[PDB]
Design a protein around this ligand. Structure first.
Ligand code: HEM
Length: 152
């Protein structure tokens, strides 16, 4: 649960992402795949990528980066009122993609890393706190749906 001041910070930071959603999305996925190679194995259409250069050169990875952050942005813009938006994502990730909640923790931290990397000195302590809380909220609500489904 975030305050309005905190949501304000979240949406302020998100303005940075929206100026270049494909670049951000690309770097998030790259940070995830290289940081946690087991995540790569969940993607049939990226499992071919062995090296980070191939990742960096992949237009389809950038495309998926756009899809992911577009979806996340839509959810963030709801400021917590995201049940309709989130449920199908929780369902597809638990039942079709079989993504453990741990991997959602991974990508959450990856977003934090990428924002610092692309905006050094421009991602303040207050901003990080707000973004972190927003991603925790997202993760926690997904986690509730995972429990419902009995998914590990
Ligand atoms: C902020 C976190 C995430 C968001 C917003 C997100 C969003 C999406 C969306 C919108 C799709 C396409 C529609 C669908 O299948 O539901 C998708 C597909 C997919 N996601 Fe996620 N996702 C997230 C995290 C993850 C993580 C952490 C993994 C694995 C480590 C993952 C694995 C997949 C896979 C394997 C697909 C299908 C890819 C394909 O074959 O086209 N997702 N995701």
């Amino acid at each position: 649960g975030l305050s309005d001041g905190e949501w304000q910070q979240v949406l302020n930071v998100w303005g940075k992402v929206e100026a270049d959603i494909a670049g951000h999305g690309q770097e998030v996925l790259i940070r995830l795949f290289t940081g946690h190679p087991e995540t790569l194995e969940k993607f049939d259409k990226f499992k071919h990528l062995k090296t980070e250069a191939e990742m960096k050169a992949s237009e389809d990875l950038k495309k998926h980066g756009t899809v992911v952050l577009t979806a996340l942005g839509g959810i963030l813009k709801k400021k917590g009122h995201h049940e309709a938006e989130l449920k199908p994502l929780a369902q597809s990730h638990a039942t079709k993609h079989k993504i453990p909640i741990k991997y959602l923790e991974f990508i959450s931290d990856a977003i934090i890393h990428v924002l610092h990397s692309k905006h050094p000195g421009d991602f303040g302590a207050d901003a990080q706190g707000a973004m972190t809380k927003a991603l925790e909220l997202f993760r926690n609500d997904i986690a509730a749906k995972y429990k419902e489904l009995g998914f590990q």
